[PDB]
């Protein structure tokens, strides 16, 4: 069946989301996430002006061909705006194919490899003790894994934050010691360094936290130069994760083949969708690397539902990040995935099982909001 | 001085161009090219909605800090849309800085390294003979270098058909004909435009060694930079690549492994003067030279700034010249000049290019997409 209509929907049920909707001649439809936090309108224009007009009249079943058409056809390849636009189309086309097959997406991908998908929760506090308070509450909600972040002693436009690496390095290990001290060894404990270290600094950190056996240490260093991971991997056995800022397998091919990471974090909506992420997960499986999908509030329930289906099938699944969306967001994107006892259960409806309530989405107009920047104490513009 | 205003202009004097204008508290101003062929409105929105609002009140003199601020601050790094928006800001701030300095941009960059900048022309035809005719006409205009292209016998994107095997059998005849009629002094360039696999490109490279090409360009899609290894190991025909790149990270290994001789990434797509300085610096360590992509889909703002960069940069190789329409030239009054096959950098402060906002408004945006290639079985291929 041919594509009859395609259009984007922009909404701000607590924060901005951009969604692509594709409708066939038969009335069947599918949606895909197109949200790129803090650059949302770039993807909206990429879709409205350059992609959507070319979708009309295309065979909706030709997912692979459409992917190549958009990826190669763009001439300028890869990039967050580019691959997010591509992801959105791809996710809507998988949604449609699954519906057409009368199957939940996980069935179409190869069937279920697990009964539930483990998540991790965000436990953040101004201080260690505040963070420990949050770990306690999330464990009570059933989470078996937690990401711990604490303040270090000492917005429409980007907020400006200040950073000290050495203050962070001397404080971080205390957080993890305190977590283990209180909650014991069974809990999976994750930590996101969020790009702020150099490789030898991350190496030191990795070593220092070895006694606390972290599930992962995430985004140690900016990795446009993938070789950046080498010194870290050679100096510590703390497991490493990276990739939420990646959009292409070509951003992480060397990382994976060299066994420099344990978990690949690139999610569906920024990594070119289901089609592209199958290939990434495939390469990963050759090197013992597992999926650890980025799952913040700035990827919509559409991506989350798709991700949960993907997580249900993919053999080398690692973990699924869970930052719950607001009530309002959840109402704008009705879905059949469910959270129970610290795990997700995939939906059983045909498609990825997520919809968009267009009338409700219309009640929340877009509101500009930018990610923060980080500066060192001398004013140097650093990595946030 | 602080930035007082910043805004984009979208105009279509023969084809689409996007331009960023930055204006300081004193009325001084600079422009930067922001044109991304076939995806123009993505860049326009990136700038209009997300970058411009943050530019206001910023110190215009802080070029480096602004570059890092937009590059790192974006969070999602690199990419065609991303690095073009950044290139436009960068180019406009260097315009402004050179203006404040009372110097043409090349002086600000380190002074002139050469007295003129060699260009190459496009010589395209349906048949080899058509091509030779175009070569002759450009040689008479003073061009010492031509990029030769002939046909292979046998609003939305046009869809072309492609056959590698027919091309591989035909292309060597074009270069042999070119040498036969024009001899050995002329530099002869060829752009394979992404259509080959590495071992195919290696075959082609070897086939054309007798004709001593200035370069063989974009042999293979190079997202995987290792793609170049087989070609380099099997032929001594020089290799150029990079018009589709936007980051030093797209080409670091290619350069460090000496897999190419010319880096093609241009100012507007490669993060501007600031980023391209670093690319040129890395290239010089490995005897790689600059060969800026210079099609009509980069505006005269880019061309003027490129000519300046070309004038200073020690490891300059060549500058591509596809002449813009007279209408384009009128929208972007400029002081670089073409003489006898070479550019001369302008001598006015800044990069020497302006935009006529009243004329630009006479040419509204019109959507136009690049072609796609399909093989004969309908496989969606590389264009
Ligand atoms: O792992 C994470 O959840 C963070 O790195 C993200 O919340 C990130 O800061 C934002 O998603 C960026 O949009
Ligand atoms: O001039 C060249 O070398 C080209 O390959 C031109 C490109 O196809 C064109 O600029 C794409 O916008
Ligand atoms: Mg993170
Ligand atoms: Mg080319």
Curated annotation (Swiss-Prot), chain B:
Its EC number is 4.2.1.-, 4.2.1.39, 4.2.1.8. It catalyses: D-mannonate = 2-dehydro-3-deoxy-D-gluconate + H2O; D-gluconate = 2-dehydro-3-deoxy-D-gluconate + H2O. It is an enzyme of class 4 (lyase). GO terms for molecular function: gluconate dehydratase activity; magnesium ion binding; mannonate dehydratase activity. This is D-galactonate dehydratase family member ManD. The record marks 295 as: Important for activity and substrate specificity. The lineage of its organism: Bacteria, Pseudomonadati, Pseudomonadota, Gammaproteobacteria, Oceanospirillales. Mg(2+) binds at residues 191, 217, 243. Has low dehydratase activity with D-mannonate and D-gluconate, suggesting that these are not physiological substrates and that it has no significant role in the in vivo degradation of these compounds. Has no detectable activity with a panel of 70 other acid sugars (in vitro). The active site is at residue 193. Its cofactor is Mg(2+). Keywords: Lyase, Magnesium, Metal-binding. Changing residue 293 to N: Abolishes activity with D-gluconate and D-mannonate. Binds 1 Mg(2+) ion per subunit.
């Amino acid at each position: 069946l041919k594509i009859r209509d395609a259009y984007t929907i922009v909404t701000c049920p607590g924060r901005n989301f951009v969604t692509l909707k594709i409708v066939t001649e038969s009335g069947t439809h599918g949606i895909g996430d197109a949200t790129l936090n803090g650059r949302e309108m770039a993807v909206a224009a990429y879709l409205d002006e350059h992609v959507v007009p070319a979708l009309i009249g295309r065979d909706a079943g030709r997912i692979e061909d459409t992917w190549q058409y958009l990826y190669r056809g763009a001439y300028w390849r890869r990039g967050p705006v580019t691959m997010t636009a591509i992801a959105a189309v791809d996710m809507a086309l998988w949604d449609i194919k699954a519906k057409a097959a009368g199957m939940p997406l996980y069935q179409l991908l190869g069937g279920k490899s697990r009964e539930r998908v483990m998540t991790y929760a965000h436990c953040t506090g101004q201080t260690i003790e505040d963070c420990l308070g949050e770990v306690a509450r999330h464990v009570e909600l059933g989470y078996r894994a937690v990401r711990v972040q604490s303040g270090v002693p000492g917005s429409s436009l980007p907020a400006e934050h200040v950073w000290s690496t050495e203050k962070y390095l001397n404080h971080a290990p205390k957080l993890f010691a305190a977590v283990r001290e209180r909650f014991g060894d069974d809990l999976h404990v994750l930590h996101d360094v969020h790009h702020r270290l150099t490789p030898i600094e991350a190496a030191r950190l990795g070593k220092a936290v070895e006694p606390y056996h972290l599930f992962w240490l995430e985004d140690c260093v900016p990795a446009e130069n993938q070789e950046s991971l080498r010194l870290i991997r050679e100096h510590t056995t703390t497991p490493l994760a990276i990739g939420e800022v990646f959009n292409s397998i070509h951003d992480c091919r060397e990382l994976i083949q060299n066994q420099w990471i344990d978990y690949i974090r690139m999610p569906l909506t920024h990594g070119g969708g289901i089609t592209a992420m199958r290939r990434v997960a495939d390469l990963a499986s050759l090197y013992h690397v597992r999926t650890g999908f980025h799952g913040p509030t700035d990827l919509s329930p559409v991506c989350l539902g798709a991700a949960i289906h993907f997580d249900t099938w993919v053999p080398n699944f690692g973990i699924q990040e869970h930052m719950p969306h607001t009530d309002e967001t959840d109402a704008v994107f009705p879905h059949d995935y469910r959270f129970e006892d610290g795990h997700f259960l995939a939906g059983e409806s045909p498609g990825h099982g997520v919809d968009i309530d267009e009338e409700l989405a219309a009640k929340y107009p877009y509101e500009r909001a930018s990610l923060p920047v980080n500066r060192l104490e001398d004013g140097t513009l650093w990595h946030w």
